[PDB]
């Protein structure tokens, strides 16, 4: 972070204090999907067998 | 406010297109930091005497 602050402040020397450098965030693992329970199926039995 | 996140909802293409505009996000972040520092200085001058 010392070198990060040096990059941020356009100088090789940084005075004592607080400086904002960048932002941080996380990422989703892969995905997640949720759908309702399967309802009654079409009566394909009387059509096939 | 984070300018990049506000403009683009975690979109790499949107961020890349926004990068072509220049350094507007950095200026806005600096202005917000200056506003926060001004508020802290104001409350310090008002109460801490």
Q: What is the DSSP string of chain B?
A: --HHHHHSSS-HHHHHHHHTT-SHHHHHHHHHHHHHHHHHHHHHHHH--
Asked if residue B23 lies in contact with residue B34, where contact means CB atoms within 8 angstroms, the answer is no
A-B contacts at Cβ under 8 angstroms: 7
What's the sign of the alpha-carbon dihedral A16, A22, A28, A30?
negative
Tell me, yes or no, if B15 comes closer than 8 A to chain A by beta carbon: no
Q: Technique behind this structure?
A: cryo-EM
Number of Cβ atoms within 10 Å of the Cβ of B18: 16
B10 to chain A, any CB pair closer than 8 A? The answer is yes
- Tell me, in Å, the resolution of the deposited structure: 2.9
């Amino acid at each position: 972070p010392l070198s990060e602050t040096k990059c941020t402040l356009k100088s090789f020397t940084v005075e004592k204090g607080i400086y904002q450098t960048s932002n941080f965030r996380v990422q989703p693992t892969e995905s997640i999907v949720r759908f309702p329970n399967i309802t009654n199926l079409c009566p394909f039995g009387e059509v096939f067998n | 406010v984070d300018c990049t996140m506000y403009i683009c909802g975690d979109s790499t293409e949107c961020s890349n297109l926004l990068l072509q505009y220049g350094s507007f996000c950095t200026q806005l972040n600096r202005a917000l930091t200056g506003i926060a520092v001004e508020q802290d200085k104001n409350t310090q001058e008002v109460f801490a005497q």
